Paper text:
Here, we employ the intracellular antibody to identify a compound from a chemical fragment library that binds to RAS proteins adjacent to the effector binding region. High-resolution crystal structures show the binding of this compound to mutant RAS, and this structural information facilitates hit to lead development. Our structure-based approach has produced compounds that bind to mutant KRAS with sub-μM affinity that interfere with RAS-effector PPI and endogenous RAS-dependent signalling in human cancer cells, and show a correlation between in vitro binding and potency in the cells. Although, various RAS inhibitors have been described in literature,24–32,47,48, in this paper we describe an approach for the development of RAS-effector inhibitors by combining different elements i.e. (i) the hit identification via a method of intracellular antibody fragment competition; (ii) structure-based design via crystal structures (KRASQ61HGPPNHP) and NMR (waterLOGSY and CPMG); (iii) identification of clear structure-activity relationship (SAR) for the development of potent compounds against KRAS and (iv) the proof of concept in mechanistic and phenotypic cell assays.
The RHS of Abd-6 was removed to reduce the molecular weight, but to maintain or increase the interaction with the protein. Abd-7 was found in five out of six protein chains. Interactions to residues from a neighbouring protein within the unit cell were also identified, same as Abd-6. The initial fragment compound (Abd-2) was improved by introducing pyridine functionalities to position 8 of the benzene ring from the benzodioxane moiety, enhancing the Kd from μM to nM with increased ligand efficiency values from 0.26 of Abd-2 to 0.34 of Abd-7. Abd-2 has no effect on the BRET signal over a range of 5–20 μM, while Abd-7 reduces the BRET signal at 5, 10 and 20 μM for all of the RAS-effector PPIs tested. The mechanism by which Abd-7 interferes with RAS-effector PPI is indicated from the crystal structure data. The binding of the CRAF, RALGDS and PI3K effectors to RAS is similar and very close to the binding site of Abd-7. In Fig. 6, RAS with bound Abd-7 is superimposed to structures of RAS-effector complexes showing that the terminal tertiary ammonium group, and adjacent phenyl ring, of Abd-7 overlaps with the bound effector structures. The competition effect of Abd-7 on the binding of the effectors with RAS in cells, can therefore be interpreted as steric hindrance of the lower affinity effectors by the higher affinity Abd-7.
Residue numbers in the entry: -3 to 169
The structure:
Amino acid sequence: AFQGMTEYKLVVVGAGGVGKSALTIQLIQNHFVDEYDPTIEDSYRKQVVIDGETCLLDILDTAGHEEYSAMRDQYMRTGEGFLCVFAINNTKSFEDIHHYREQIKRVKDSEDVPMVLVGNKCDLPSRTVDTKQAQDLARSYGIPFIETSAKTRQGVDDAFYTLVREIRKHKEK
Ligand SMILES: Nc1nc2c(ncn2[C@@H]2O[C@H](COP(=O)(O)OP(=O)(O)NP(=O)(O)O)[C@@H](O)[C@H]2O)c(=O)[nH]1
Ligand SMILES: COc1nc(-c2cccc3c2OCCO3)ccc1Nc1ccc(CN(C)C)cc1
Ligand SMILES: [Mg+2]
């Protein structure tokens, strides 16, 4: 029997200040947060319909810098898919993406972990990471790339829905 909607555990990772929380709060509350309040760890839930299937998204919003290693390993083991977020005006956040991805692959002991590359703050004028560079990186990993703005809401739904589609593909192989 059906016992309730399918649940997906999604984790949002990336460097300090790239907009992890702003993306999530835009999804959950349709609200843009202008303030920068560094996260420790926050948990959100949302019911949505993606490709005709109702599902419950359990979303973990993480700290940019994870001081304490055992807590970080736990959410990497529990997460089924990961949004790897950088900011298109912060080159260093883009270079850090490779490190997040390697850490997740190591902890899950798998080459094929559902992931989406997210280039956030695409509303800002001071772009230092080119779209083409980000697409190349994502193509090298075999994952989708999406440009977002937590401010304008561009790509916000798409980033999360695309990640659910990646998790579904991985569960049906
Ligand atoms: N213009 C613009 N600013 C953004 C965007 N996304 C986030 N911001 C801003 O960037 C700052 C940090 O965003 P926040 O969500 O707190 O980042 P975080 O990645 O969760 N930081 P931490 O890792 O410490 O929790 C905030 O001032 C926020 O308004 C965006 O898409 N466009
Ligand atoms: C415990 O279940 C949850 N687990 C996670 C979660 C997702 C991915 C990785 C993780 C996670 O958790 C810790 C370890 O690693 C997120 C939300 C809830 N749950 C949740 C969140 C918010 C509400 C809304 N409620 C506060 C009003 C309800 C359920
Ligand atoms: Mg945050």
